[PDB]
C-alpha cells in the first residue's frame, strides 16, 4: 500500500503540489503543498518520512536557489522545516544510506557544486563529506550495496557521461566506467541489482534511450527505450518496476507517467500527472 510521491516541479514557475499515485487502484492523491515553490528538488523517503532536499523557486518575482530540507509526515499531512544544508543546491542528486541523507552536487547561481554533504534526521544536522571528482549539476544517484554512484550531468562547461562510486565506510568517491551517453538531467534508480539511466539531455537533443550499469561486469547496456523523450524527469521503483514522471520532452511539459517491466524490456504508459510539469522530486512510502 506503499504511494508514489511527487513534490514541487516547474510549469511556467517552480510548483508547490505534492501528490501521491496508488498504482494499485489509480487514484491520485492531493496533498498538503509545500511551503515554498520548488523544482530542480529531489525527494526521498527516510523512517516513513517524505524528505523534499534543494532546488530552486522559479517565480516571476526572481529565482532562488534553495538550501532548504523539508519534511513531509503522512500521518498528518504536515510539511516542517528541518536544518538547511550548508549551501543551496538546484538540479540535486541525493540518496540515502543506513538512514542518512546524501545531498550531491547540483548549483548555487554559477557555481556548480562538487561538494557532498550527509544528513542525520536523529540528530537534524548536515556535514560535509568527500566532494565528488567532479562538479556535477543535473546529476543522478542510486544507491547500491550501501555505496552511493552519481551518474552523468553538468560540470559547468561538459556535460558528462562519466560516473563516480562514493563509499562511506572509506570516505571516498571512484570513478567508474562511463555511461554510453552523455545525460544531464537523466533520472537514475537502482532495479534488481543494476543502476539504471533513463532519459535526460546529451547535449544536441532530449533523450527516450535507457542504459544499465552491472557493477560486475562493469557494463553499460541499452534497454527498451521510453515511449517519450524526457529530460528533468522524475523516477522511482515500485514493486519491482521503475516509474518515471513528467519532464520536458523538447516541446512540452508531460503530463505522462511510464512504467519499466525489466522481466519484458517494456515500457507502458500507466496514468497522467494532475498537470505536466519538470523537475519534480519523487519518493516512495
Ligand atoms: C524550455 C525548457 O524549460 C525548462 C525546462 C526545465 C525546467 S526545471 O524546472 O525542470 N529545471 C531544470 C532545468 C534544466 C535546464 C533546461 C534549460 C533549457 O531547456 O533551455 C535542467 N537540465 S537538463 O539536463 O534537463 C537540460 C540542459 C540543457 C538543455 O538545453 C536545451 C537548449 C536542456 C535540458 C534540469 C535538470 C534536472 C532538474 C531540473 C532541471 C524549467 C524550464
Known amino acids: 500500500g506503499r504511494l508514489i510521491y511527487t513534490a514541487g516541479g516547474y510549469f511556467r514557475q517552480s510548483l508547490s503540489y505534492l501528490e501521491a499515485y496508488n498504482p494499485s487502484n489509480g487514484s491520485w492523491l492531493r496533498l498538503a503543498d509545500l511551503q515554498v515553490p520548488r523544482s530542480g528538488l529531489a525527494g526521498c523517503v527516510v523512517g516513513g518520512l517524505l524528505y523534499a532536499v534543494g532546488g530552486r523557486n522559479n517565480s516571476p ?143 544536441q537533443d532530449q533523450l527516450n534511450s535507457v542504459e544499465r550499469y552491472d557493477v560486475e561486469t562493469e557494463t553499460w547496456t541499452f534497454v527498451a527505450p521510453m515511449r517519450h523523450h524526457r529530460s528533468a524527469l522524475g523516477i522511482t521503483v515500485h514493486q519491482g518496476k521503475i516509474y518515471v514522471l513528467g519532464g520536458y520532452d523538447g516541446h512540452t511539459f508531460l503530463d505522462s507517467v511510464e512504467c519499466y517491466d525489466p522481466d519484458s524490456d517494456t515500457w507502458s504508459e500507466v496514468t497522467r500527472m494532475t498537470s505536466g510539469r519538470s523537475g519534480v522530486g519523487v519518493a516512495v512510502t
Open 61 to 203: 518575482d526572481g529565482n532562488t536557489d534553495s538550501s532548504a530540507l523539508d519534511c513531509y509526515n503522512p500521518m498528518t499531512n504536515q510539511w516542517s522545516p528541518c536544518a538547511s544544508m550548508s549551501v543551496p543546491r538546484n538540479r540535486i542528486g541525493v540518496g540515502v544510506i543506513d538512514g542518512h541523507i546524501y545531498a550531491v552536487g547540483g548549483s548555487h547561481g554559477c557555481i556548480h557544486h562538487s561538494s557532498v554533504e550527509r544528513y542525520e534526521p536523529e540528530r537534524d544536522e548536515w556535514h560535509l563529506v568527500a566532494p565528488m571528482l567532479t562538479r556535477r549539476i543535473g546529476v543522478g544517484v542510486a544507491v547500491l550495496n550501501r555505496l552511493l554512484y552519481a551518474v552523468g550531468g553538468f560540470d559547468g562547461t561538459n556535460r558528462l557521461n562519466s560516473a563516480e562510486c562514493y563509499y562511506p565506510e572509506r570516505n571516498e568517491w571512484r570513478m567508474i566506467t562511463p555511461m554510453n551517453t552523455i545525460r544531464s538531467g537523466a533520472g537514475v534508480c537502482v532495479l534488481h541489482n543494476c543502476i539504471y539511466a533513463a532519459g535526460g539531455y546529451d547535449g
